[model samples]
Target: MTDSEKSATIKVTDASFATDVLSSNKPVLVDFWATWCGPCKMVAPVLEEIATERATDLTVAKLDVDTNPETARNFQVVSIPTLILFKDGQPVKRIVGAKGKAALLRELSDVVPNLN
Candidate 1:
Protein backbone atom coordinates (compact mmCIF):
# COMPACT_ATOMS: atom_id res chain seq x y z
CA MET A 1 0.00 0.00 0.00
CA THR A 2 1.12 3.54 -0.59
CA ASP A 3 1.72 6.00 2.24
CA SER A 4 -1.62 7.66 1.56
CA GLU A 5 -3.37 4.28 1.87
CA LYS A 6 -1.37 2.72 4.72
CA SER A 7 -1.61 5.77 6.93
CA ALA A 8 -4.94 6.79 8.33
CA THR A 9 -5.47 10.47 7.49
CA ILE A 10 -7.28 12.38 10.19
CA LYS A 11 -9.51 14.90 8.55
CA VAL A 12 -10.13 18.33 10.00
CA THR A 13 -13.77 18.56 10.94
CA ASP A 14 -16.00 21.36 12.19
CA ALA A 15 -15.08 20.64 15.79
CA SER A 16 -11.31 20.43 15.38
CA PHE A 17 -10.98 22.53 12.28
CA ALA A 18 -9.58 25.73 13.76
CA THR A 19 -7.03 24.03 15.95
CA ASP A 20 -5.84 21.64 13.29
CA VAL A 21 -5.49 23.97 10.33
CA LEU A 22 -5.93 27.62 11.23
CA SER A 23 -3.83 27.69 14.35
CA SER A 24 -0.84 26.08 12.71
CA ASN A 25 2.35 28.12 12.99
CA LYS A 26 3.68 26.88 9.70
CA PRO A 27 2.04 27.17 6.31
CA VAL A 28 -1.06 24.93 6.24
CA LEU A 29 -2.23 23.35 3.02
CA VAL A 30 -5.89 22.60 3.52
CA ASP A 31 -7.30 20.33 0.88
CA PHE A 32 -11.00 20.88 0.46
CA TRP A 33 -12.40 17.65 -0.90
CA ALA A 34 -15.21 15.11 -0.91
CA THR A 35 -15.27 11.31 -1.27
CA TRP A 36 -16.76 11.44 -4.74
CA CYS A 37 -14.29 14.03 -5.97
CA GLY A 38 -12.22 12.42 -8.70
CA PRO A 39 -9.60 15.17 -8.78
CA CYS A 40 -9.25 14.96 -5.02
CA LYS A 41 -8.35 11.28 -5.27
CA MET A 42 -5.79 12.08 -7.94
CA VAL A 43 -4.05 14.67 -5.75
CA ALA A 44 -4.14 12.57 -2.59
CA PRO A 45 -0.79 10.93 -3.19
CA VAL A 46 0.85 14.15 -4.27
CA LEU A 47 -0.38 15.84 -1.11
CA GLU A 48 0.94 12.97 0.99
CA GLU A 49 4.33 13.21 -0.62
CA ILE A 50 4.48 16.96 -0.12
CA ALA A 51 3.64 16.51 3.55
CA THR A 52 6.33 13.88 3.91
CA GLU A 53 8.95 15.98 2.13
CA ARG A 54 8.28 19.17 4.08
CA ALA A 55 7.26 17.60 7.34
CA THR A 56 8.73 20.37 9.43
CA ASP A 57 8.05 23.41 7.28
CA LEU A 58 4.50 22.74 6.18
CA THR A 59 1.33 21.47 7.83
CA VAL A 60 -0.83 19.49 5.42
CA ALA A 61 -4.46 18.73 6.14
CA LYS A 62 -7.58 17.46 4.42
CA LEU A 63 -11.01 18.86 5.19
CA ASP A 64 -13.98 17.08 3.69
CA VAL A 65 -16.47 19.51 2.19
CA ASP A 66 -19.25 17.05 2.89
CA THR A 67 -18.35 16.56 6.53
CA ASN A 68 -16.86 19.98 7.23
CA PRO A 69 -19.13 22.26 5.28
CA GLU A 70 -18.78 25.19 7.65
CA THR A 71 -15.10 25.74 6.99
CA ALA A 72 -15.26 24.86 3.33
CA ARG A 73 -18.20 27.14 2.71
CA ASN A 74 -16.65 29.97 4.68
CA PHE A 75 -13.65 29.83 2.37
CA GLN A 76 -15.83 29.70 -0.75
CA VAL A 77 -14.39 26.41 -1.85
CA VAL A 78 -16.67 25.67 -4.78
CA SER A 79 -14.18 23.39 -6.48
CA ILE A 80 -13.14 19.95 -5.40
CA PRO A 81 -9.41 19.42 -4.78
CA THR A 82 -8.96 23.07 -3.96
CA LEU A 83 -5.80 23.63 -1.99
CA ILE A 84 -5.70 26.68 0.28
CA LEU A 85 -2.45 27.73 1.78
CA PHE A 86 -2.89 29.32 5.18
CA LYS A 87 -0.40 31.30 7.15
CA ASP A 88 -1.19 33.32 10.27
CA GLY A 89 -4.75 32.00 10.05
CA GLN A 90 -5.22 33.78 6.73
CA PRO A 91 -5.41 32.13 3.34
CA VAL A 92 -2.46 33.16 1.20
CA LYS A 93 -3.07 31.03 -1.86
CA ARG A 94 -5.79 28.88 -3.35
CA ILE A 95 -4.75 26.22 -5.84
CA VAL A 96 -7.45 24.23 -7.60
CA GLY A 97 -7.11 20.72 -9.05
CA ALA A 98 -4.27 18.23 -9.08
CA LYS A 99 -0.74 19.31 -9.89
CA GLY A 100 2.69 17.69 -10.05
CA LYS A 101 5.13 18.06 -7.16
CA ALA A 102 7.45 20.32 -9.09
CA ALA A 103 4.62 22.61 -10.11
CA LEU A 104 3.24 22.78 -6.60
CA LEU A 105 6.64 23.50 -5.10
CA ARG A 106 7.29 26.23 -7.61
CA GLU A 107 3.95 27.84 -6.94
CA LEU A 108 4.36 27.52 -3.21
CA SER A 109 7.82 28.98 -3.28
CA ASP A 110 6.51 31.86 -5.34
CA VAL A 111 3.69 32.63 -2.94
CA VAL A 112 5.84 32.31 0.16
CA PRO A 113 9.21 33.30 -1.10
CA ASN A 114 10.81 33.01 2.34
CA LEU A 115 10.19 29.25 2.32
CA ASN A 116 13.35 28.75 0.33
Candidate 2:
Protein backbone atom coordinates (compact mmCIF):
# COMPACT_ATOMS: atom_id res chain seq x y z
CA MET A 1 0.00 0.00 0.00
CA THR A 2 1.16 3.52 -0.70
CA ASP A 3 1.66 5.84 2.19
CA SER A 4 -0.17 9.14 2.24
CA GLU A 5 1.85 12.34 2.12
CA LYS A 6 2.11 14.27 5.36
CA SER A 7 1.51 18.00 5.36
CA ALA A 8 4.66 20.08 5.52
CA THR A 9 3.01 23.39 6.36
CA ILE A 10 3.82 25.28 9.55
CA LYS A 11 1.13 25.63 12.23
CA VAL A 12 0.74 29.18 13.49
CA THR A 13 -0.95 30.70 16.53
CA ASP A 14 -1.52 34.22 17.79
CA ALA A 15 1.41 33.90 20.15
CA SER A 16 3.82 33.00 17.38
CA PHE A 17 2.42 35.41 14.84
CA ALA A 18 5.17 37.96 15.20
CA THR A 19 8.07 35.57 15.12
CA ASP A 20 6.76 32.89 12.77
CA VAL A 21 5.01 34.95 10.14
CA LEU A 22 5.75 38.65 10.43
CA SER A 23 9.46 38.13 10.78
CA SER A 24 9.80 35.25 8.39
CA ASN A 25 12.81 35.22 6.09
CA LYS A 26 10.69 34.30 3.07
CA PRO A 27 7.20 35.25 1.99
CA VAL A 28 4.50 33.57 4.09
CA LEU A 29 1.12 32.43 2.79
CA VAL A 30 -1.07 32.03 5.84
CA ASP A 31 -4.36 30.20 5.49
CA PHE A 32 -6.96 31.04 8.08
CA TRP A 33 -9.05 27.88 8.59
CA ALA A 34 -11.01 25.81 11.10
CA THR A 35 -11.52 22.11 11.78
CA TRP A 36 -15.25 22.18 10.97
CA CYS A 37 -14.76 24.10 7.72
CA GLY A 38 -15.47 21.94 4.67
CA PRO A 39 -13.76 24.24 2.17
CA CYS A 40 -10.76 24.51 4.43
CA LYS A 41 -10.42 20.72 4.38
CA MET A 42 -10.65 20.69 0.59
CA VAL A 43 -7.87 23.27 0.30
CA ALA A 44 -5.66 21.69 2.93
CA PRO A 45 -4.11 19.20 0.56
CA VAL A 46 -3.44 21.87 -2.01
CA LEU A 47 -1.59 23.99 0.53
CA GLU A 48 0.37 20.90 1.50
CA GLU A 49 1.71 20.52 -2.01
CA ILE A 50 2.43 24.23 -2.24
CA ALA A 51 4.22 24.16 1.09
CA THR A 52 6.43 21.31 -0.02
CA GLU A 53 7.04 22.33 -3.60
CA ARG A 54 7.51 26.04 -3.00
CA ALA A 55 9.60 25.70 0.11
CA THR A 56 12.47 27.59 -1.46
CA ASP A 57 10.73 30.89 -2.18
CA LEU A 58 7.63 30.65 0.00
CA THR A 59 6.58 29.46 3.42
CA VAL A 60 3.08 28.12 4.00
CA ALA A 61 1.39 28.59 7.35
CA LYS A 62 -1.95 27.38 8.73
CA LEU A 63 -3.92 28.98 11.54
CA ASP A 64 -6.92 27.27 13.12
CA VAL A 65 -9.54 30.00 13.56
CA ASP A 66 -11.27 28.21 16.40
CA THR A 67 -8.11 27.84 18.41
CA ASN A 68 -6.47 31.03 17.21
CA PRO A 69 -9.26 33.55 17.22
CA GLU A 70 -6.94 36.44 17.96
CA THR A 71 -5.17 36.15 14.64
CA ALA A 72 -8.40 35.63 12.68
CA ARG A 73 -9.95 38.71 14.27
CA ASN A 74 -6.83 40.78 13.70
CA PHE A 75 -6.79 39.88 10.03
CA GLN A 76 -10.54 40.54 9.74
CA VAL A 77 -11.10 37.15 8.22
CA VAL A 78 -14.89 36.89 8.02
CA SER A 79 -14.84 33.61 6.15
CA ILE A 80 -12.94 30.38 6.43
CA PRO A 81 -10.02 29.48 4.17
CA THR A 82 -9.05 33.13 3.87
CA LEU A 83 -5.48 33.11 2.65
CA ILE A 84 -3.22 36.11 3.13
CA LEU A 85 0.27 36.30 1.85
CA PHE A 86 2.66 38.32 3.97
CA LYS A 87 5.83 39.78 2.58
CA ASP A 88 8.32 41.89 4.47
CA GLY A 89 6.22 41.95 7.62
CA GLN A 90 3.05 43.07 5.86
CA PRO A 91 0.09 41.63 4.02
CA VAL A 92 0.59 41.72 0.27
CA LYS A 93 -2.08 39.46 -1.15
CA ARG A 94 -5.38 38.14 0.15
CA ILE A 95 -7.48 35.40 -1.40
CA VAL A 96 -10.83 34.32 -0.03
CA GLY A 97 -12.59 31.00 -0.66
CA ALA A 98 -11.16 27.80 -2.10
CA LYS A 99 -9.40 27.63 -5.44
CA GLY A 100 -7.78 24.97 -7.61
CA LYS A 101 -3.99 24.73 -7.64
CA ALA A 102 -3.76 26.20 -11.12
CA ALA A 103 -5.97 29.14 -10.25
CA LEU A 104 -4.05 29.72 -7.07
CA LEU A 105 -0.74 29.68 -8.91
CA ARG A 106 -2.05 32.12 -11.47
CA GLU A 107 -3.28 34.54 -8.82
CA LEU A 108 -0.08 34.36 -6.81
CA SER A 109 2.44 34.23 -9.63
CA ASP A 110 2.81 37.98 -9.68
CA VAL A 111 3.05 38.44 -5.92
CA VAL A 112 5.14 35.37 -5.13
CA PRO A 113 8.66 36.12 -6.21
CA ASN A 114 10.62 33.28 -7.84
CA LEU A 115 7.47 31.16 -8.21
CA ASN A 116 7.57 29.23 -11.46
Candidate 3:
Protein backbone atom coordinates (compact mmCIF):
# COMPACT_ATOMS: atom_id res chain seq x y z
CA MET A 1 0.00 0.00 0.00
CA THR A 2 1.07 3.56 -0.57
CA ASP A 3 2.05 5.88 2.29
CA SER A 4 -1.39 7.48 2.47
CA GLU A 5 -3.22 4.17 2.32
CA LYS A 6 -0.93 2.47 4.87
CA SER A 7 -1.95 2.24 8.50
CA ALA A 8 -0.37 4.65 10.90
CA THR A 9 1.12 4.44 14.36
CA ILE A 10 -1.66 6.54 15.78
CA LYS A 11 -1.81 8.63 18.90
CA VAL A 12 -5.14 7.83 20.46
CA THR A 13 -7.30 9.75 22.88
CA ASP A 14 -10.26 8.88 25.11
CA ALA A 15 -12.61 9.85 22.33
CA SER A 16 -10.92 7.69 19.72
CA PHE A 17 -9.92 4.67 21.81
CA ALA A 18 -13.04 2.56 21.35
CA THR A 19 -13.27 3.06 17.62
CA ASP A 20 -9.56 2.78 16.98
CA VAL A 21 -8.85 -0.18 19.23
CA LEU A 22 -11.92 -2.19 20.13
CA SER A 23 -13.52 -1.85 16.73
CA SER A 24 -10.41 -2.52 14.69
CA ASN A 25 -10.44 -5.53 12.41
CA LYS A 26 -6.67 -6.00 12.66
CA PRO A 27 -4.57 -6.98 15.64
CA VAL A 28 -3.78 -3.89 17.66
CA LEU A 29 -0.85 -2.88 19.82
CA VAL A 30 -1.69 -0.22 22.35
CA ASP A 31 1.24 1.48 24.00
CA PHE A 32 0.21 3.20 27.21
CA TRP A 33 2.78 5.89 27.90
CA ALA A 34 3.38 9.18 29.66
CA THR A 35 5.31 12.18 28.38
CA TRP A 36 7.46 12.61 31.49
CA CYS A 37 8.48 8.97 31.77
CA GLY A 38 12.00 8.24 30.56
CA PRO A 39 11.30 4.57 29.92
CA CYS A 40 8.24 5.45 27.88
CA LYS A 41 10.36 7.65 25.62
CA MET A 42 12.96 4.91 25.36
CA VAL A 43 10.41 2.43 24.02
CA ALA A 44 8.69 4.89 21.71
CA PRO A 45 11.11 4.40 18.82
CA VAL A 46 10.94 0.65 19.11
CA LEU A 47 7.15 0.77 18.90
CA GLU A 48 7.43 3.09 15.92
CA GLU A 49 9.77 0.66 14.20
CA ILE A 50 7.37 -2.17 14.81
CA ALA A 51 4.53 -0.06 13.48
CA THR A 52 6.45 0.58 10.27
CA GLU A 53 7.78 -2.93 9.82
CA ARG A 54 4.58 -4.73 10.77
CA ALA A 55 2.22 -2.30 9.16
CA THR A 56 0.41 -4.91 7.12
CA ASP A 57 -0.42 -7.27 9.99
CA LEU A 58 -0.78 -5.09 13.02
CA THR A 59 -2.12 -1.70 14.02
CA VAL A 60 -0.09 0.31 16.52
CA ALA A 61 -1.50 3.07 18.71
CA LYS A 62 -0.40 5.21 21.61
CA LEU A 63 -2.57 6.30 24.54
CA ASP A 64 -1.09 8.93 26.75
CA VAL A 65 -1.62 7.78 30.32
CA ASP A 66 -1.64 11.29 31.59
CA THR A 67 -4.14 12.55 29.08
CA ASN A 68 -6.45 9.56 29.04
CA PRO A 69 -6.58 8.51 32.63
CA GLU A 70 -9.89 6.68 32.24
CA THR A 71 -8.57 4.35 29.60
CA ALA A 72 -5.44 3.69 31.62
CA ARG A 73 -7.47 3.00 34.72
CA ASN A 74 -9.76 0.67 32.81
CA PHE A 75 -6.76 -1.29 31.60
CA GLN A 76 -5.05 -1.17 35.01
CA VAL A 77 -2.04 0.61 33.57
CA VAL A 78 -0.20 1.81 36.65
CA SER A 79 3.13 1.94 34.88
CA ILE A 80 4.14 4.48 32.29
CA PRO A 81 5.32 2.07 29.60
CA THR A 82 2.86 -0.74 29.12
CA LEU A 83 2.33 -2.50 25.83
CA ILE A 84 -0.91 -4.37 25.29
CA LEU A 85 -1.62 -6.62 22.35
CA PHE A 86 -5.22 -7.01 21.35
CA LYS A 87 -6.65 -9.48 18.87
CA ASP A 88 -10.29 -9.48 17.85
CA GLY A 89 -10.82 -6.48 20.10
CA GLN A 90 -9.74 -8.27 23.26
CA PRO A 91 -6.39 -8.00 25.00
CA VAL A 92 -4.33 -11.14 24.59
CA LYS A 93 -0.85 -10.11 25.76
CA ARG A 94 0.83 -7.43 27.75
CA ILE A 95 4.46 -6.38 28.23
CA VAL A 96 5.58 -3.95 30.87
CA GLY A 97 8.71 -1.76 31.23
CA ALA A 98 11.37 -0.97 28.67
CA LYS A 99 12.23 -3.91 26.46
CA GLY A 100 14.85 -4.37 23.75
CA LYS A 101 14.01 -4.93 20.12
CA ALA A 102 14.70 -8.65 20.26
CA ALA A 103 12.43 -9.16 23.22
CA LEU A 104 9.72 -7.09 21.66
CA LEU A 105 10.04 -8.96 18.37
CA ARG A 106 9.92 -12.31 20.14
CA GLU A 107 6.76 -11.46 22.01
CA LEU A 108 5.10 -10.01 18.95
CA SER A 109 6.22 -12.94 16.81
CA ASP A 110 4.39 -15.33 19.11
CA VAL A 111 1.13 -13.45 18.74
CA VAL A 112 1.37 -11.92 15.26
CA PRO A 113 0.92 -15.02 13.12
CA ASN A 114 0.28 -13.39 9.73
CA LEU A 115 3.60 -11.53 9.65
CA ASN A 116 6.65 -13.27 8.14
Tens digits of per-residue lDDT for model 3 on 17-110?
8898999888888999997899998987888887888788788899998877998988899877999989878888988899776777777788
Residue-level lDDT of model 2, residues 71-114, one tens digit each, is 89999989889988887778888989997777766666777654
Q: Backbone clashes in each candidate structure, one number apiece?
A: 0, 0, 0
Q: Model 1 over residues 1-116: C-alpha lDDT tens digits?
A: 36654442446888888888777777777888987888888887888887777665666788889777798887888878888888867778887888777877776676566455
- lDDT comparing candidate 3 with the true structure: 0.84
Cα-based lDDT at residue 52, candidate 3: 83
Question: What's the lDDT for all of these models?
Answer: 0.76, 0.82, 0.84
Better of 1 and 3 by TM-score: 3
Give the higher-lDDT candidate: 1 or 2. Answer: 2
Quick one: best TM-score, which candidate?
Answer: 3
Q: What's the lDDT for residue 11 in model 1?
A: 69
Superposition error at 102 for model 1 (Å): 1.2
Better of 2 and 3 by TM-score: 3
